[PDB]
Amino acid sequence: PLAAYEVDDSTGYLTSDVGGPIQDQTSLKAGIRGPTLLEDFMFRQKIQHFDHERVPERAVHARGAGAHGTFTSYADWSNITAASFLNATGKQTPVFVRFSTFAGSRGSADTARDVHGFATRFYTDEGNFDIVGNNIPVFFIQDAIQFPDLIHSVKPRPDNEIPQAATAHDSAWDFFSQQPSTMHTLFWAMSGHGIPRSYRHMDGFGVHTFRFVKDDGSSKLIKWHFKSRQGKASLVWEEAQVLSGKNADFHRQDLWDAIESGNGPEWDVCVQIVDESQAQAFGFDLLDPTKIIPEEYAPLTKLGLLKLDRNPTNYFAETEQVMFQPGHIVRGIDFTEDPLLQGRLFSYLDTQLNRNGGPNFEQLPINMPRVPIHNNNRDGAGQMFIHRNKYPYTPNTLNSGYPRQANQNAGRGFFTAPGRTASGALVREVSPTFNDHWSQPRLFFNSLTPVEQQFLVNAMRFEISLVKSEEVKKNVLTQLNRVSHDVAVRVAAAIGLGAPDADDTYYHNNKTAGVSIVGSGPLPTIKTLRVGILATTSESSALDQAAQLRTRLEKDGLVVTVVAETLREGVDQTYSTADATGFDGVVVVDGAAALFASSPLFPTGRPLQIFVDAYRWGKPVGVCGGKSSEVLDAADVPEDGDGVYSEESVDMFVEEFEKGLATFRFTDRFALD
Amino acid sequence: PLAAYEVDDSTGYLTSDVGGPIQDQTSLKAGIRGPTLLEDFMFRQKIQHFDHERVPERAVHARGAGAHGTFTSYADWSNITAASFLNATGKQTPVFVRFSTFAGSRGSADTARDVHGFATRFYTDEGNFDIVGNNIPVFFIQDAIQFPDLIHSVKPRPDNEIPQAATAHDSAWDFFSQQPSTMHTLFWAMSGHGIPRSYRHMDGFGVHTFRFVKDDGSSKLIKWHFKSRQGKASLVWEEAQVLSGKNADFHRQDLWDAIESGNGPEWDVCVQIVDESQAQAFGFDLLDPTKIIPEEYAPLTKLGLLKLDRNPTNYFAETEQVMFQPGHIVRGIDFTEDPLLQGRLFSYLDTQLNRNGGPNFEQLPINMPRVPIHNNNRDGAGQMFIHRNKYPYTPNTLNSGYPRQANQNAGRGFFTAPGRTASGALVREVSPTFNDHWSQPRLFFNSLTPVEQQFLVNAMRFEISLVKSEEVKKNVLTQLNRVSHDVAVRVAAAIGLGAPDADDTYYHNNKTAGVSIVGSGPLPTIKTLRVGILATTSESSALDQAAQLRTRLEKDGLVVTVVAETLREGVDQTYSTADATGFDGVVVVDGAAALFASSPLFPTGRPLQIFVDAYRWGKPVGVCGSEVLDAADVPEDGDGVYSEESVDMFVEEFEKGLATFRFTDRFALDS
Amino acid sequence: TEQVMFQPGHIVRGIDFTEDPLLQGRLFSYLDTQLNRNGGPNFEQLPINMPRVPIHNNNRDGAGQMFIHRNKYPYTPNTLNSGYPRQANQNAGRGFFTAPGRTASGALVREVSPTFNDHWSQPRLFFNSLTPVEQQFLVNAMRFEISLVKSEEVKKNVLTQLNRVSHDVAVRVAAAIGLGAPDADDTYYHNNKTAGVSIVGSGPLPTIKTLRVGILATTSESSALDQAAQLRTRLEKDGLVVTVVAETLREGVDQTYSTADATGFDGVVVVDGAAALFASSPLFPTGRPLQIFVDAYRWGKPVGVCGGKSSEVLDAADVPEDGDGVYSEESVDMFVEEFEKGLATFRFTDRFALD
């Protein structure tokens, strides 16, 4: 896809950047034990390059990972949009997607509790079109001017830069409690959507209302929804924390691996579409980025399929250097007067100057379009083009009036939706239509399962209990209470304050479909899911059972890891490196039962800790071979529990265990208030 | 110390950067539901600043933390060096120190297994002097030109950028096994030195041989050693991994807290001093940065005290922007022909152009000297001075010959040690004197305790089992076996390969003092160490027990956290947020026994897991008030296990255990 | 000077923008372009750019950050820094505020207001307001530049636009470049004038202080230097900058004929003791002394000979004694009094031909 820019070093002699063959292993010296010479250009070119390898990390979403793929349109969508990449059944457009967390710096853990980015570039035949989205459909704030306040509050305290990749400190919760617009996103981040199981098991949302614009100039309002074909799934917090230490790269590795194994993830690219006249028809303002349109009021139209199926060749060149902009817009789409979106337009063009160090960042292979470029932009540091047109001004006669102006009527220009209008004073004021900060957070909460609601309360309990200021904590309970009195009461319990009296202004009982994770049924596929098989070298029997299990499980697309004391034929991982965070389900072969009752080869109690951890975190666990009580009794796991399996028959074991993998989590193991 | 540069925003109205009062909470729009206007300069100035907040992270040592302090000279050292900061008994020089890991990016965890940076700036009355050191006294490679090879191999694989902050992958071990100079630093990194308990519980080393130069021109060869006065301590690996998730900020938080509480860490700044004639006298070449001088051959001389006692005011401005250079040298010190050192001098000047974006990085407050600057450097982006001298060239008459040249005999100039010499062909060749890559790794290994040796084998077992390539794994065994056959046998066992036959060229039995962690006796102080008291709100007796334990422990300078199901008066932390990685010792109060036998307030089994984790990780653990110890399966007769009715008897025992710090009998040994 | 970074966005309370679509865009440009010049976002921290009042805001970090901020809670709204800094606006803290009478209405358009469409009437007003010679100078600048335009079609297109402002201008510029002017097109012609835009019409200068007088002398006669010295004293008293020019430097001589040029002077005086120079030396280029006097005259400057013998200098220069702005007195005092009026007059525009 970027094949034209690739550099092959599978053969040949080392050269400088200017093609002179050289060596690079010993410095030039005055004598064998002498000082290094200034004239050693080999040394200096190589070390200068190294000294300058790094670029500024993104200001937000610094930690992330990307892949190439393809978008395919299901129809000719000319009836609703002029957009070219949507103009034909089966029409294919190359994409590049980067996923990310939000707060953390570029080496922070994938499995922090955070908002996640989901940024998609369509290299369309009428220009690059970016949808720069998140895994959560609403944002914290209602005006782009507040962006640095939010980000300052969420990032580490600036005297000591503590804590990394976390909202669990005074400043973030001070901001949330003083700025109540944040409530809706906060509730999302405190649910399982804050700790998704993988990039593949989350959705993407454009967040803002945009416009679809036909060639005749008429427009409709839309929201983007990228709906996962892998299903929605999350971690539990106490698993996430351990995972952040055991494997900071979990999400990027999961994505890389799924793509390498031929299981590249897929989304349905959907929109909600409503009329301009419905901007305030739903009990809120469609310009307000803190609100969703409940699916009951407007259903998804599936536009096409997004599949990621190709890993990058060089992470830095492709993933680190990709520079998205919501200003990368194409004919057939337009902006709205969402004051959050409005300010983003400025920010993303400006910030790339910081990252790239110069104005020619669109010339980087990953940012280049796949159609010709005709304009009078010139010069700048790092200019890679050699322009032939020596009259780069409009209007001209000396280049015969080229390039020609493009617009609604000619050259398939972008155009602002011609129905759009402005009226009134030039104001720095907030629309009173934006003022209800609480009803939609309550709607979201109502729509979770009882155990899911517990998980969310328990996340707030965790975070707020780490806030040092009593006053901030009181202010936090004040805002929570406006969403739900019960939530305030339950989180106050953990922090030894009293909740304030019920304030019912915004209370209600309504629910909406499609926002719950635990409620979304079993996963539609178990391909790529990870099964750990805990075995031993001390019994040839155990290794036999493991091999039999492997054969049967791998037939169904599961990634099987056999664990034992030491590596050898058929064993993938040692107990020393193994951890429950590494598996979606854990099986002990009964040949290995003795290990679950000391070794220099692994930390004491490791085999049993993996089983106990997996059970406590809600995963399918079991013993295969028929003798289960020694292991289960050691783990305090009840033989009759949901998602606990015990069979002698390998075929029967796997048939039951695979249902448990699709269920994914057994939530009956978590206590409720 | 940087007070002149401080900005106070505790009062006043919001202004732009040019002092015009503004607001910053709502955009300017055409109508109340209208589009944002280009003429909103309040918006654009604020968001432009934010857009440009980030600067490139350091190419290595990107993850770090810093503090201000003071160095105090013990003596007048004029008899060995001309260095002004060492020229009088009791002479004080402000310092700034940054500690770091090595491989990880910004945000990665403090408790990765890694080499650690320990970079010290002395703002002397004769210029800034930097010692840019590590916690390990030898480096991987023997020539600066190999640095990008080492770093590429150790940092994440460049197709997918995995794994973060770790040598546990094919490329690192490919390089190690192909470049055997790496063996000595590798053995250090695979020891407890790879996972120190804090910045305060590690030493600092200059690594290279440098020269001390007297005013009379004569020179001696030296090594810098910063010897911790808190003692040396490490984590265990299985604890460190969890810690990296539970608190990535563990080291920087430990440093911040120690300073805030009046317990700023101290080091004795030391040197080994030897004659120029002894360059090759110790069985290796003093120019070779992969070798130590055993303390048996050359004892340490204490020059003065380094103390850190002041946290920064703004992390970015001070810690992130501090730009160290070994080129920051002062009269009385000189370089050697160490080819690793030689190339560092180029690198650290060049690299600040990347970080700062321009040539005036020395004008940042944290980089400024504390004496006047007189030179003819001019212009450049971000120029902060207004130079009065309009004839900035030498030689001149129009500025009366100023600034004047400084040298050995005038203006206290820096001078290259005058005895230094060069001879021979201009070569890109390695000295044969560098060729022994294995003896000193074996020296180091020999000097560790039996269980220390086991930890190191187990770290290699852990990492090498993750290396996918069979051929790389075999190549690694070939190298380890040249250091020790027994090491190669023991790590080969974990990876299902056969160890190669013993090859005894570099085997020996010698030991050297001062390199072992577990062997270095109990900690000389237990101030700052963390005790978690596990209690319950369901019994008032439990809280009374915890409160009484608190009073007695805090007297002795320990940081006490009382844990229970929920927060209230006397309780610091919930079981939900508590972890054994957060404590140096764990005490259960009798009255809370029931908890160790389910709750919506914390994950199932959390209270007993803390206690069990702590025990298995080697910590002092106890019950104050056998029921608990049974449930935990912790033996009452265990070293570092405590069981006492009386709070006074308990504390007195338990504090002895905190000084011992780790009970290593809890770890299995090979064969 | 090099580092000063101006912005129209540097605005204060009591002033506001208009919807001038040129002004509007400038506001973006000057903030952005400083990133290029400075290489980073902290350009307002350069000494020449700093304000002379306290700065209170939550801008942080960036390359070249020179401040050490004490406020560790730089976000609004906060309680952890007690709500500081406080928002400033019309009603509090002397905030900037957009003029509240300001309003917008209509479609979001990339369209030009028809109110902007007269491009020619005001150029005509400007031209009408210049003096005849001044109009000739303008025509001649156009003649100079347009004759260097190589494309025939461009030159024709230029004549088209010129003709819409003034047919006479089009005809006169066209004569120099060998094309015909298009026929008169009177849509925008008029005879209106406006005050204060003319240079040559704005009367004598109000002060001659700082103006430059070159006195051309010689070392060959000790009387020439005595004359130069008398003139210097008289002229410097009135705050003129006097350069005495001779073949070589010495006490009283400021520069050599070799470095001297008419472009260096607002007026040129020859002391009649130096007449023989105006009639070869290794010390300056052939004919330099006469050339300085001839250039000065032809460029419209006051020129003169002081001492009483003028005819040899004036005749060699083809300058008429009775010319305006040509002076010839024996008396130093009388010479200076006359010459200084010529310096205020500044240029003698009768020396330039009209169409």
Ligand code: HDD
């Ligand atoms: C006005 C400032 C501001 C506001 C209000 C937004 N952000 Fe943004 N965003 C940026 C300022 C910006 C940025 C600082 O300009 C970034 C950082 C790196 C970059 O290229 O743009 C960016 C990064 C960026 C990334 C990473 C892109 C990549 O992977 O390279 C994603 C996914 C988003 N943001 C998503 C959004 C969502 C869904 C928003 C709310 C609807 C949002 N941002 C609000």
Ligand code: HDD
């Ligand atoms: C030729 C390249 C070169 C080589 C051979 C070395 N390094 Fe280095 N080091 C760098 C090039 C580098 C650098 C890339 O230039 C850094 C990164 C950021 C910086 O300011 O300098 C640096 C960072 C740096 C830091 C972080 C300083 C801070 O806290 O800001 C420390 C502590 C060290 N290194 C210490 C060492 C030691 C003890 C070495 C072996 C004796 C050594 N380096 C070899």
Ligand SMILES: [Ca+2]
């Ligand atoms: Ca904070």
Ligand SMILES: [Ca+2]
């Ligand atoms: Ca690798």
Ligand SMILES: [Ca+2]
């Ligand atoms: Ca730059």
